[PDB]
């Protein structure tokens, strides 16, 4: 009938891809096909392993004749459950169709029914009245054993649906199918290759198949090995096929497959381009013009990035894990924010002051216990999944509950944080930076003595008290931030003034500041303990406040050409406004 599909006929015309390997799996199924009791086999394994292909592959082998003589003539049919229910509008239509099919099979005694997703029949034909389920109709024949059927299910299934009804499970013989080894996968791809080569009119290199399996399992962790490798191979041919010329590349070579894996895994590709090569080269100076001082922190951040792109990087850890500690007003956070801008990647920020309670930490990995809503996603895992190449900033990590550290421990050591739903987040390309203010009180503390002692070591001890040895062992570097020097402050003043000029440019105002005035601001605003934040306040009172009055009501409403100069006699600035 139309519902049934003779797989053997399909193979005869090339409609089923050939099977490679899995001889033990076929032998276990064939041994079960011929056993007196529990004749029905069940193919159970994870998605994308080959369970469906094995059932179709069996028919392919039969037509070829490389099967046991007992199974020399065994027709394998495929049930289309959708077609069974297509016209079952009137009462008894489902039974007539299903019973007509079973009668056909028992008469032959050679025909075998392959039913994919066997768990689906557990509720078919349950409209109303008789409520004759499809499993109920098949159960009598299966118990006797006159009819042989083949099933397929996932590990998710076979526990929640099929195993509920012991009547069906007892008859079926479970078979465990596991993904093949890396070496086995290369053999499989080589066997399927001629069909993919013809479709795309390209020749895959021997090394390319090894790279596809090795690269995909290494970076593509959301799928199983057989389909995962085949996906890369299928896409690689299409990429070459769509070149502007009819066929720019008639064959696929190593380092071409890498491009496909990069798009699928959203990881930076190897063979770095001149555009990104120059960016990494200038990533040490571009940051030094925005963040002054703390050169040791910039080098640690850029070297870890350069290493990963070069190919020398941790196998399972992230690109780099750093802890930024030190006094206030120093560029602990700013350097992280500017890093993401210099690299052109998404910045993931997480103010850890909002994760003090234990339940808050859970939100990162998953929703609350038994959350009624469907949005059971995690905040940390989703962000990393959405942006695998990013800067994972965790400011004020000290405030966060200790549980957060236990989460980062597996991240720094394994690079993957599985979520409640089973999705695996990849941290291999996400920079992990954590800023802490632990021991900041010691930095500003003044000793009881003529000389003010350093107190930096005391602050480090406090840091060690909170961050256990395990956490500090997995950190690539614990960069301490030195206090801002006078020379640095002068550079910082230019930065804030430039920002002021940008705000003024939006109002058609141009500001010129004499060098003498800049030093006056630096001297007045320089505070070693408080860093650079006071400088911003000094700019507000001296520069922004007079300008604000003029901008709102004065010569600078629609004008500009402001000229500031400091008179030495009164050590006070002189604001000159031109109406323009």
């Amino acid at each position: 009938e139309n519902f049934t599909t003779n797989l053997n006929q399909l193979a005869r015309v090339g409609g089923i891809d050939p099977l490679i390997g899995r001889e033990k799996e076929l032998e276990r199924a064939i041994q079960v096909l011929c056993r007196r009791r529990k004749n029905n086999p069940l193919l159970v394994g994870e998605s994308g392993v080959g369970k469906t292909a094995i059932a179709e592959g069996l028919a392919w082998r039969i037509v070829q004749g490389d099967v046991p003589e007992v199974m020399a003539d065994c027709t394998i049919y495929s049930l289309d459950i959708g077609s069974l229910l297509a016209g079952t509008k009137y009462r008894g239509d489902f039974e007539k169709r299903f019973k007509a099919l079973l009668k056909q099979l028992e008469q032959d005694t050679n025909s075998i029914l392959f039913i994919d997703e066997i768990h689906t029949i557990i509720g078919a034909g349950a409209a109303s009245g008789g409520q004759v389920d499809a499993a109920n109709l098949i159960k009598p024949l299966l118990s006797s054993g006159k009819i042989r059927v083949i099933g397929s299910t996932t590990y998710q299934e076979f526990s929640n649906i099929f195993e509920k009804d012991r009547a069906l499970a007892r008859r079926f013989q479970k078979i465990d199918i596991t993904e093949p080894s890396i070496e086995e996968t290369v053999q499989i791809i080589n066997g399927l290759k001629p069909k993919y080569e013809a479709h795309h009119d390209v020749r895959y290199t021997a090394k390319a198949v090894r790279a596809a399996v090795e690269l995909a399992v290494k970076y593509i962790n959301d799928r199983h090995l057989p389909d995962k490798a085949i996906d890369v191979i299928d896409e690689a041919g299409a990429r070459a096929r769509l070149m502007p010329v009819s066929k720019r590349k008639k064959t696929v070579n190593v380092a071409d497959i890498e491009s496909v894996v990069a798009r699928i895994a959203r990881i930076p590709e190897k063979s770095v381009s001149q555009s990104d090569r120059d960016t990494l080269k200038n990533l040490g100076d571009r940051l030094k013009m925005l963040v002054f001082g703390q050169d040791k922190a910039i080098e640690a951040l850029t070297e870890a990035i350069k290493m990963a792109r070069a190919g020398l990087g941790h196998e399972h850890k992230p690109v780099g894990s750093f802890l930024f500690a030190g006094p206030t007003g120093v560029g602990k956070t700013e350097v992280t924010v500017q890093l993401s801008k210099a690299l052109g990647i998404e910045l993931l920020r997480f103010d850890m002051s909002e994760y003090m309670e234990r339940h808050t930490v859970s939100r990162l990995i998953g929703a609350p216990p038994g959350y009624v809503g469907f949005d059971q996603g995690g905040l940390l895992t989703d962000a990393v999944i959405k942006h695998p190449h990013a800067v994972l900033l965790l400011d004020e990590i000290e405030k966060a509950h200790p549980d957060v550290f236990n989460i980062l421990l597996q991240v720094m050591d394994n690079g993957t944080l599985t979520d409640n739903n089973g999705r695996k987040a990849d941290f291999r390309n996400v920079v992990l930076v954590m800023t802490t203010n632990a021991g900041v009180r010691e930095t500003e503390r003044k000793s009881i003595g003529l000389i003010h002692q350093d107190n930096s070591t005391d602050a480090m001890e406090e840091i060690k008290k909170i961050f256990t040895p395990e956490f500090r062992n997995r950190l690539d570097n614990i960069i301490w931030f030195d206090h801002l020097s006078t020379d640095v402050i002068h550079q910082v003043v230019d930065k804030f003034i430039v920002e002021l000029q940008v705000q003024l440019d939006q109002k058609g105002v141009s500001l010129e500041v004499s060098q003498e005035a800049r030093n006056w601001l630096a001297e007045k605003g320089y505070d070693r303990a408080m860093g650079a934040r006071p400088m911003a306040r000094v700019i507000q009172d001296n520069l922004k406040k007079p300008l604000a009055n003029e901008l709102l009501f004065g010569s600078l409403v629609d004008g500009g050409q402001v000229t500031v100069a400091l008179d030495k006699e009164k050590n006070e600035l002189t604001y000159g406004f031109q109406s323009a």
Binding site: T88, K89, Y90, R91, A127, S128, G129
Partner: peptide, 11 residues
């Protein structure tokens, strides 16, 4: 609690 129902006419 809300579940769809599929009916069948007698003939």
């Amino acid at each position: 609690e809300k579940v769809r129902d599929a009916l069948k006419p007698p003939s």
